[PDB]
């Protein structure tokens, strides 16, 4: 990478199909808060705030723990 930031935000976000994905997705309590903040949040996959807009692991962990097309 060109900068040592250590943070990446994903192409699909709340629509990402694999539950173990290491990149950045929105709060699981709301799919319509896009990611604007380039920071790893504190509750991650249990962040209950519907107005958060930070970086989390994949929503497929609470949504659909079974991948397809990525499998
Ligand atoms: Zn992803
Ligand atoms: Zn959060």
UniProtKB/Swiss-Prot annotation:
Origin superkingdom: Eukaryota
Subcellular location, record wording: Nucleus; Cytoplasm
Coiled-coil boundaries: none
Zinc finger (C3H1-type) stretch: 10-25, 41-56
Modification after translation: Methylated by HMT1.
UniProt similarity note: Belongs to the ZC3H14 family.
Note: Present with 9670 molecules/cell in log phase SD medium.
Function: RNA-binding protein involved in RNA processing and transcription regulation. Acts as a regulator of mRNA stability: binds the poly(A) tail of mRNAs and pre-mRNAs, preventing their degradation by the exosome. Involved in the biogenesis of circular RNAs (circRNAs) which are produced by back-splicing circularization of pre-mRNAs. Involved in mRNA poly(A) tail length control and nuclear export. Functions in surveillance and the packaging leading to generation of export-competent mRNPs.
Subunit structure: Interacts with MLP1. Interacts with PUB1.
Record remark: domains: The N-terminal domain is required for nuclear export of both poly(A) RNA and NAB2. The RGG domain is important for NAB2 import.
Protein name per UniProt: Nuclear polyadenylated RNA-binding protein NAB2
Species of the source: Saccharomyces cerevisiae (strain ATCC 204508 / S288c) (Baker's yeast)
């Amino acid at each position: 990478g060109s900068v040592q930031t250590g943070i990446v935000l994903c192409k699909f976000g709340a629509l990402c199909s694999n539950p173990s994905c290491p990149f950045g997705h929105p709060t699981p309590a709301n799919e319509d808060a896009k990611v604007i903040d380039l920071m790893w949040c504190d509750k991650n996959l249990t962040c209950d705030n519907p107005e958060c807009r930070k970086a989390h692991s994949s929503l497929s962990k609470i949504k659909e723990v079974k991948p397809i097309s990525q499998k």
